[PDB]
Design brief:
This protein has 5 domains: 154 residues, Sandwich (Lipoxygenase-1); 100 residues, Lipoxygenase-1, domain 2 (Irregular); 89 residues, Lipoxygenase-1, Domain 3 (Lipoxygenase-1, domain 3), CATH 4.10.372.10; 127 residues, Nuclear Transport Factor 2, Chain: A (Roll); 347 residues, Lipoxygenase-1, Domain 5 (Lipoxygenase-1, domain 5). It is built from 24 helices and 22 strands. The longest helix has 44 residues. The protein is globular, with a radius of gyration of 28 Å. The protein starts with a strand and ends in a 30-residue tail after the last helix. It binds fe (iii) ion. The PDB classes it as oxidoreductase.
Length: 822
C-alpha cells in the first residue's frame, strides 16, 4: 500500500544572478499530500492523504539536468483513496525553492502519473492557501473529474486576487492596471506623463497590476519602486547569469548610462562624430574611455558580454551584419528600398492605387495636405503613371498622417527637429523596388519634394532626405511595430489566460509557452526603457511624447488585421487568390518577410487546426466552455477594454473562431515579434543606416550649414542624426535585445516533453516540429537561389534568415522564439 515517488527541484541559488544546503530538505522540511481524483469526501471534494516528507536524495536518476536535485518519497495510499490526481505541498523551510516535477511509479506505465510543476514554492506561512499542483491530464471544464472540480475553481480564484493590495515578490496574483507608472512627478514636475489607458483620448492595452499606491503629488500616477512586481512564476531564473538579458536593460539605465555621461561631461572623448570613420571605429579599434568608466562597466553581469575590452581603455562593439561584406552598401537607394521588405521593419509599406496620395487629416488644422509630388517628376523606367498604377507597381511608405499631429510639439524640443515623410517606391521589371521621390512635410522652413540624384549637392540633399525617412521609420518600428504590436498588445492575453483558464485546460496548454518571459521583460521596460527620462526617451526622436504617440496609433489597432494574410491584403501588397497555396498572391513576388512568413503562418495554422478538434468536436463545445468564455470576455472587455466596443472582435462561438484567435496570438508572440526584433543590431548597429533621431531641418541656401553640406557631406549627415552619446546607449540596448539567450525555447520546442498525457496532442506537436525543419530547408534554398538575390541579399549581401525557425545562442540574425522573451 505504498506509492513510490520522485520529486525534482532546483535550490534557490542555482537560478539566481549565498549557499544552498541539500540535506536541509530532508527531515520534516517539505510535506506533500496526495489528493484523490476518484474518491470524494462528504462535500464532493477529493480525499486528501497524510503529510508525507522527503525521505532522501536520489543521485541514481540519469535524466537530471543542470542544477536539478531529485528526492525520494513514499506515500501510504490504501484502497479507500482511489487514484491520485493532484497534490498539496508545504515548504516549512525559510528559503524558497523551484519545484520542477513529481512522478508516481506504478506496476507498468500507465499508470505512471506525472506532475509538471515548474513553480517557486515559498514558506507555507506566506500563502493564504496551500499550493496545489495537478497531474498532466488535460480537461475542458465539463470533463474534470468531479472530486477535482472545486480544487480547479479555488485555484483560479487564488490567481485572480481581489483587485486590491500591494503585490509582493511571492504573490501569484494576475490583474490589470493602466500605464500610470511611467511618470515620476514626485521627483520633478517635468517628469509627469499622461496616464495611458482608460480613456478615449489615450486608449492603451492594460498591463500587469502592481499596486504600489499613488504618488504624493498626483493621485492618479503610481509611485516608483525598486522592483516592479510580476507574478512570481513569470520572473524567470536562469542557470547562467549571462542569460538574464532582461536585467541588462536595468543595469544600462542605472549604472552604464551615467558612466558614459560622465565621460562626455569631462570632455574625455569628443562630443560629436566628425566623419563616418569615427562611427566605423566603434567596432574596429573601439572607443577609448577613462579607466574608471571601463572599471565601472565590465564587472557587471550581462553588460560585460556586450563589448570587447582591453580592461583599461577600450570598448569595442561587435561588427554589425549590415557592414560585414560592404562598408558602404547601406548608402545605396537599392538597400534603402530593400530594407522596407527585408529589414528590421518590413511590415509598413503599402500599395498605391491612386495618385497623388491623400491625407486623412483635418484640412482646418493642417491646411491642404494633398501630396505635392507630381507624376511628371518621376522616373518610372519608361512607364507612365497610368501603366504603373494599373499594373500595381507603385508603393508607398507613408508617415505623413502618423507624424504630422506631433511635428510641432517635437520640433519645439531642444535638440530635435523632424519632418513628416512620404516615400514613393517603384517595383521595377527585375522585381526590385526603386525609390523615386521623398516628400518632407511640416505643419502650417517649408514642405518639399526631393528626387533622387547621384551627383552634386542634390545628391547630399537626397541622402539627408532618406535619413529623415528612416528616423520616421525607426521611431515607428520601435514604438509601434515592436513595442505596441507585440509586447504591449500581448500582455493582456497573458493576464486573462492565468485568471480564467485552468492549468488543466487544453487552451492554457496550447498558449502559455508563447508567453514565456513576456510580463517580466515588459515590467523591466516600464521601469527603465519607456519611463520618464528612460532609455527610449533619451535615444529616440519624440522624447517625452514617445509612448503617447503609440496610444494614438493604438486607436487604429485591429486584432484580426494582425493575421499575416489579412495584413498583406489590408496594406495592398497582396490580393486574395484561391489559386495559390496560401490564399493570397504577393504583388511583390520575392517580398522576403511575407513569403517566408506565409510558410511559418501555415505551419502554425496546421498545428492549431489539428490540436483544437482533439478537445472540441462542435461549435457547441466552444460556446459551452465556461472558462474559455470568461477568458475571452475579460481579455476584450478589460485587457483591451478601451477597444471593447469595436465590431471586429471575434465572438468565439465556433470552432473556426477559436482556431483564428489562437493562431493570431501565437503568430504575434513568435514569428511577428522575431521578425521585428532580432534584426535590430544587425541592421541598426550602424547608426547611419538606422538613425533614431534627427536634430535639424534641411539647411537653407546661403547659410554656413549649406556650405558645409557642399564641402563635407559626412559631417552634414552626422550633424543631422543621433549624436554620439545617445548612439552609444542605443547601440548597447539593441545589442541586448537582438541576442538569443542560451535557455531560449524556440518554435516547435517545449520545456518539458510531458506537458500533457494526451498522446494524440504529443504526436500532432511532433508533426509541427518536423514541418518547421522542412520549412527551414526551404528558406535556405531561397537564400541560395540566384533569381532572388536582389531582394533576399541585396547590395549588403546579407541573406534574410530572420524567419529561420532554429538558432544557436547569441546575436545570430535567425531563430523564432516561442514568445516575446526579450
Ligand atoms: Fe522585443
Amino acid at each position: 500500500h505504498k506509492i513510490k515517488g520522485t520529486v525534482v527541484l532546483m535550490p534557490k541559488n542555482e537560478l539566481e544572478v549565498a549557499v544552498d544546503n541539500l540535506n536541509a530538505f530532508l527531515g520534516r522540511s517539505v510535506s506533500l499530500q496526495l489528493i484523490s481524483a476518484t474518491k470524494a469526501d462528504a462535500h464532493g471534494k477529493g480525499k486528501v492523504g497524510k503529510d508525507t516528507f522527503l525521505e532522501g536524495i536520489n543521485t541514481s536518476l540519469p535524466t537530471l539536468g543542470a542544477g536539478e536535485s531529485a528526492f525520494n518519497i513514499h506515500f501510504e495510499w490504501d484502497g479507500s483513496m482511489g487514484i491520485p490526481g493532484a497534490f498539496y505541498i508545504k515548504n516549512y523551510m525559510q528559503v524558497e525553492f523551484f519545484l520542477k516535477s513529481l512522478t508516481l511509479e506504478a506496476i507498468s506505465n500507465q499508470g505512471t502519473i506525472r506532475f509538471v510543476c515548474n513553480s517557486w514554492v515559498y514558506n507555507t506561512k506566506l500563502y493564504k492557501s496551500v499550493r496545489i499542483f495537478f497531474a498532466n491530464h488535460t480537461y475542458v471544464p465539463s470533463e474534470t473529474p468531479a472530486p477535482l472540480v472545486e480544487y480547479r475553481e479555488e485555484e483560479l480564484k487564488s490567481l485572480r486576487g481581489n483587485g486590491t493590495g500591494e503585490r509582493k515578490e511571492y504573490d501569484r496574483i494576475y490583474d490589470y492596471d493602466v500605464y500610470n507608472d511611467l511618470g515620476n512627478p514626485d521627483k520633478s514636475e517635468k517628469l509627469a506623463r499622461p496616464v495611458l489607458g482608460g480613456s478615449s483620448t489615450f486608449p492603451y492595452p492594460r498591463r500587469g497590476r502592481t499596486g504600489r499606491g499613488p504618488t504624493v503629488t498626483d493621485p492618479n500616477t503610481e509611485k516608483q519602486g525598486e522592483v516592479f512586481y510580476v507574478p512570481r512564476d513569470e520572473n524567470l531564473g536562469h542557470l547562467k547569469s549571462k542569460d538574464a538579458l532582461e536585467i541588462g536593460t536595468k543595469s544600462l539605465s542605472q549604472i552604464v548610462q551615467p558612466a558614459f555621461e560622465s565621460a562626455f561631461d569631462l570632455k574625455s572623448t569628443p562630443i560629436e562624430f566628425h566623419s563616418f570613420q569615427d562611427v566605423h571605429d566603434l567596432y574596429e579599434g573601439g572607443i577609448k574611455l577613462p579607466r574608471d568608466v571601463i572599471s565601472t562597466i565590465i564587472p557587471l553581469p550581462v553588460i560585460k558580454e556586450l563589448y570587447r575590452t582591453d580592461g583599461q581603455h577600450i570598448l569595442k562593439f561587435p561588427q554589425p551584419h549590415v557592414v560585414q561584406v560592404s562598408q558602404s552598401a547601406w548608402m545605396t537607394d537599392e538597400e534603402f528600398a530593400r530594407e522596407m521588405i527585408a529589414g528590421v521593419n518590413p511590415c509598413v509599406i503599402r500599395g498605391l492605387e491612386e495618385f497623388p496620395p491623400k491625407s486623412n487629416l483635418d484640412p482646418a488644422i493642417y491646411g491642404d495636405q494633398s501630396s505635392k509630388i507630381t507624376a511628371d517628376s518621376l522616373d518610372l523606367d519608361g512607364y507612365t503613371m497610368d501603366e504603373a498604377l494599373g499594373s500595381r507597381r507603385l508603393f508607398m511608405l507613408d508617415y505623413h498622417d502618423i507624424f504630422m499631429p506631433y511635428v510641432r510639439q517635437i520640433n519645439q524640443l531642444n535638440s530635435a527637429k523632424t519632418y513628416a515623410t512620404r516615400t514613393i517606391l517603384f517595383l521595377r521589371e527585375d522585381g526590385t523596388l526603386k525609390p523615386v521621390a521623398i516628400e518632407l512635410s511640416l505643419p502650417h522652413a517649408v514642405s518639399q519634394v526631393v528626387l533622387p540624384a547621384k551627383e552634386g549637392v542634390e545628391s547630399t540633399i537626397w541622402l539627408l532626405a532618406k535619413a529623415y525617412v528612416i528616423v520616421n521609420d525607426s521611431c515607428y518600428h520601435q514604438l509601434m511595430s515592436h513595442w505596441l504590436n507585440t509586447h504591449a498588445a500581448m500582455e493582456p492575453f497573458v493576464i486573462a489566460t492565468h485568471r480564467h483558464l485552468s492549468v488543466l485546460h487544453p487552451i492554457y496548454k496550447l498558449l502559455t509557452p508563447h508567453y514565456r518571459n513576456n510580463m517580466n521583460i515588459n515590467a523591466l521596460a516600464r521601469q527603465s526603457l519607456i519611463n520618464a527620462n528612460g532609455i527610449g526617451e533619451t535615444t529616440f526622436l519624440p522624447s517625452k511624447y514617445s509612448v503617447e504617440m503609440s496610444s494614438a496609433v493604438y486607436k487604429n489597432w485591429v486584432f484580426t488585421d494582425q493575421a499575416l494574410p489579412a495584413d498583406l491584403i489590408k496594406r495592398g501588397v497582396a490580393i486574395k487568390d484561391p489559386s495559390t497555396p496560401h490564399g493570397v498572391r504577393l504583388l511583390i513576388e520575392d517580398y522576403p518577410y511575407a513569403a517566408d512568413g506565409l510558410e511559418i503562418w501555415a505551419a502554425i495554422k496546421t498545428w492549431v487546426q489539428e490540436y483544437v478538434p482533439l478537445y472540441y468536436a462542435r461549435d457547441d463545445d466552444v460556446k459551452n466552455d465556461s472558462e474559455l468564455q470568461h477568458w475571452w470576455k475579460e481579455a476584450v472587455e478589460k485587457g483591451h477594454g478601451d477597444l471593447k466596443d469595436k465590431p471586429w472582435w471575434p465572438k468565439l462561438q465556433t470552432l473556426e473562431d477559436l482556431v483564428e484567435v489562437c493562431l493570431i496570438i501565437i503568430w504575434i508572440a513568435s514569428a511577428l515579434h522575431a521578425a521585428v526584433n532580432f534584426g535590430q543590431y544587425p541592421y541598426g548597429g550602424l547608426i547611419m543606416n538606422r538613425p533614431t533621431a534627427s536634430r535639424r531641418l534641411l539647411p537653407e541656401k546661403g547659410t554656413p550649414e549649406y556650405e558645409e553640406m557642399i564641402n563635407n557631406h559626412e559631417k552634414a549627415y552626422l550633424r543631422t542624426i543621433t549624436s554620439k552619446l545617445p548612439t552609444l546607449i542605443s547601440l548597447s540596448v539593441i545589442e541586448i535585445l537582438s541576442t538569443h539567450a542560451s535557455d531560449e525555447v524556440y518554435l516547435g520546442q517545449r520545456d518539458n516533453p510531458h506537458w500533457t498525457s494526451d498522446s494524440k496532442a504529443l504526436q500532432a506537436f511532433q508533426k509541427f516540429g518536423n514541418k518547421l525543419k522542412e520549412i527551414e530547408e526551404k528558406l535556405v534554398r531561397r537564400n541560395n537561389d540566384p533569381s532572388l538575390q536582389g531582394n533576399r541579399l541585396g547590395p549588403v549581401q546579407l541573406p534574410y534568415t530572420l524567419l529561420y525557425p532554429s538558432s544557436e545562442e547569441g546575436l545570430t540574425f535567425r531563430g523564432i522564439p516561442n514568445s516575446i522573451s526579450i
